Design an enzyme around this catalytic site. Sequence first.
Site, mmCIF file in Angstrom:
data_model
loop_
_atom_site.group_PDB
_atom_site.id
_atom_site.type_symbol
_atom_site.label_atom_id
_atom_site.label_comp_id
_atom_site.label_asym_id
_atom_site.label_seq_id
_atom_site.Cartn_x
_atom_site.Cartn_y
_atom_site.Cartn_z
ATOM 1 N N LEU A 26 -49.276 -11.217 -51.235
ATOM 2 C CA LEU A 26 -49.689 -11.083 -49.902
ATOM 3 C C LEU A 26 -48.458 -10.872 -48.902
ATOM 4 C CD1 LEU A 26 -52.783 -11.445 -50.803
ATOM 5 C CD2 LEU A 26 -52.715 -13.733 -49.998
ATOM 6 N N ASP A 86 -44.967 -23.892 -33.519
ATOM 7 C CA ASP A 86 -44.635 -22.271 -33.955
ATOM 8 C C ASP A 86 -46.039 -21.768 -33.984
ATOM 9 O OD1 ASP A 86 -43.498 -19.862 -34.813
ATOM 10 O OD2 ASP A 86 -43.251 -20.683 -37.022
ATOM 11 N N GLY A 125 -40.802 -13.654 -48.446
ATOM 12 C CA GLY A 125 -39.706 -14.254 -47.613
ATOM 13 C C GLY A 125 -39.126 -15.702 -48.212
HETATM 14 C C1 LIG Z 1 -50.519 -12.832 -45.526
HETATM 15 C C2 LIG Z 1 -52.008 -12.892 -45.937
HETATM 16 N N1 LIG Z 1 -52.912 -13.953 -46.231
HETATM 17 C C3 LIG Z 1 -53.989 -14.114 -46.591
HETATM 18 N N2 LIG Z 1 -54.522 -15.172 -46.699
HETATM 19 C C4 LIG Z 1 -53.999 -16.399 -46.611
HETATM 20 N N3 LIG Z 1 -54.701 -17.574 -46.676
HETATM 21 C C5 LIG Z 1 -53.821 -18.564 -46.859
HETATM 22 C C6 LIG Z 1 -52.596 -18.213 -46.745
HETATM 23 C C7 LIG Z 1 -51.705 -19.288 -46.749
HETATM 24 O O1 LIG Z 1 -50.271 -18.961 -46.482
HETATM 25 N N4 LIG Z 1 -51.839 -20.453 -46.850
HETATM 26 C C8 LIG Z 1 -50.599 -21.437 -46.997
HETATM 27 C C9 LIG Z 1 -50.129 -21.936 -48.295
HETATM 28 C C10 LIG Z 1 -50.365 -21.226 -49.405
HETATM 29 C C11 LIG Z 1 -48.892 -22.857 -48.136
HETATM 30 C C12 LIG Z 1 -48.840 -23.365 -46.975
HETATM 31 C C13 LIG Z 1 -49.263 -23.108 -45.759
HETATM 32 C C14 LIG Z 1 -50.207 -22.179 -45.679
HETATM 33 CL CL1 LIG Z 1 -51.102 -21.684 -44.189
HETATM 34 S S1 LIG Z 1 -52.256 -16.585 -46.692
HETATM 35 C C15 LIG Z 1 -54.725 -12.916 -46.725
HETATM 36 C C16 LIG Z 1 -53.939 -11.505 -46.564
HETATM 37 N N5 LIG Z 1 -54.579 -10.359 -46.565
HETATM 38 C C17 LIG Z 1 -53.526 -9.243 -46.634
HETATM 39 C C18 LIG Z 1 -54.041 -8.100 -45.778
HETATM 40 N N6 LIG Z 1 -55.358 -7.826 -46.057
HETATM 41 C C19 LIG Z 1 -55.915 -6.654 -44.857
HETATM 42 C C20 LIG Z 1 -57.376 -6.865 -44.766
HETATM 43 O O2 LIG Z 1 -57.806 -5.440 -44.606
HETATM 44 C C21 LIG Z 1 -56.377 -8.896 -46.022
HETATM 45 C C22 LIG Z 1 -55.949 -10.097 -46.890
HETATM 46 N N7 LIG Z 1 -52.713 -11.578 -46.093
#
Ligand SMILES: Cc1nc(Nc2ncc(C(=O)Nc3c(C)cccc3Cl)s2)cc(N2CCN(CCO)CC2)n1
Length: 256
Positions: free
Chosen positions: A17, A122, A20
């Site tokens: 996804l 943040d 960094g």
């Molecule tokens: C960057 C991103 N994250 C998505 N969902 C996430 N859920 C939770 C996330 C997260 O980081 N959890 C977390 C963790 C794991 C550890 C510490 C703290 C935290 Cl908060 S990231 C979905 C997504 N997509 C890409 C683009 N697409 C376009 C649609 O058309 C949709 C789908 N991209």
Amino acid sequence: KDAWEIPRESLRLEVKLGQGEVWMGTWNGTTRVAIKTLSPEAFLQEAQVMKKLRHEKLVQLYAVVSEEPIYIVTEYMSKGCLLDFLKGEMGKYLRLPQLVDMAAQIASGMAYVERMNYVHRDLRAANILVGENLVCKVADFGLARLFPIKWTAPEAALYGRFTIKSDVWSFGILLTELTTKGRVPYPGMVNREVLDQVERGYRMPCPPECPESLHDLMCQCWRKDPEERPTFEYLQAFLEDYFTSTEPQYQPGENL
Ligand SMILES: Cc1nc(Nc2ncc(C(=O)Nc3c(C)cccc3Cl)s2)cc(N2CCN(CCO)CC2)n1
């Protein structure tokens, strides 16, 4: 080890996804999860905060893999960050009632952070995640404890005074992101110019089509005196009740 620990074997990483560095996957074969790979003790401090926090509008910690290679595991948010959502193909159909609702939800998460005596540090659209049915949840607790200057309250940027009140400042800046479909705050101004100006009393104007009542809510979040700014409790109730108590004769426009 505490009871949040799991075997690394139980984690199937799939689609990358971000970097960094977050992945979409599955946990124990049945559960759609998000997984954040990576001092490794500063990386674990995020999960530490996240173990103490539990709210419908904060991304839920599911599990940690506390031994290298390390992983943090959470619920999966299907629509990615709010910033990209706002600027992409979805953004153009978002009107004021959807955007104030998203803001109410964020305010609700931060009201929880506020009740728990935490500071986020943040708060911005890049750090909000969107799920199904336009659910918004506060993410990225790396700087949370019991900085981009454009979102950061002046006392915190200059002197290091981060409080729930500087998060309130950041929330006002996030409201500009919502109402401009995610434009960078202070257009055409560099960091230094933002510092100098904000210190001389400069505040961003009412964005086009944004009711003055919402811009007044931004200006209250931007009071020079951190203690003058509203609480998240007040923000959540104001934004929940907005189209009845504050703009009952709101009429849809071309953009908001
Ligand atoms: C960057 C991103 N994250 C998505 N969902 C996430 N859920 C939770 C996330 C997260 O980081 N959890 C977390 C963790 C794991 C550890 C510490 C703290 C935290 Cl908060 S990231 C979905 C997504 N997509 C890409 C683009 N697409 C376009 C649609 O058309 C949709 C789908 N991209």
